[PDB]
Design a binder for this molecule. Sequence first.
Ligand SMILES: [Zn+2]
Ligand SMILES: [Zn+2]
Ligand SMILES: [Zn+2]
Lengths: 8, 229
Amino acid sequence: XXLXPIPE
Amino acid sequence: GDQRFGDLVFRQLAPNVWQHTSYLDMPGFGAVASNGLIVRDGGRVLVVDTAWTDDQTAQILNWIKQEINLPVALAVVTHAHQDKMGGMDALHAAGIATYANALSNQLAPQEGMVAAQHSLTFAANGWVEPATAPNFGPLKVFYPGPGHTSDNITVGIDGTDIAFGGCLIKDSKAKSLGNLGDADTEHYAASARAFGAAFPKASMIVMSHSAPDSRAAITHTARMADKLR
Ligand SMILES: [Zn+2]
Ligand SMILES: [Zn+2]
Ligand SMILES: [Zn+2]
């Protein structure tokens, strides 16, 4: 999801 | 030193500078902190980056209203990701003038972000064209080159020990550069070093996902990036 460091 | 205000934290870093922190609870992964800056410059406030969401960004404006009670002249956002640009509608609803790297504004739709109202452009040396950043007061905006993203920008606060690396810089104790998905692994190391050279007097390095650190965060980040190229 493009949640900064979290790629999902 | 931390002050809590709804779901947000504010830490005073200088007489006229605060770090804002917002969190996104992700199931299993846990809460993820994102940091920005609030700057008091005479009779107005300047914001660097939004929170993850419109609601969280509205709470930043409420806190400023409560603790500083000056109008927010402008906000600058440091790239087209949710942690930095998630709250653009909340700044707009408040009639706040928003600035981003032209490329951030260009990438925004693909990234699911609302574009800033104004575009920043940069000289070949990385320094912002002053005509695109009118009345930025102590905000010295520098494009260090591609790294975390192609559009990542950085901000020094003139007359302080503070420079803001955003998501480009990791803390001096970081085990890795995290996810290398949207990253320029070739130019990252040089971009980290350019940030360093742009703000040589900055002894406090503020970043998106770690507590404020020493210049060791710049050299560590650059040395991790060296092992990619
Ligand atoms: Zn980030
Ligand atoms: Zn990012
Ligand atoms: Zn992306």
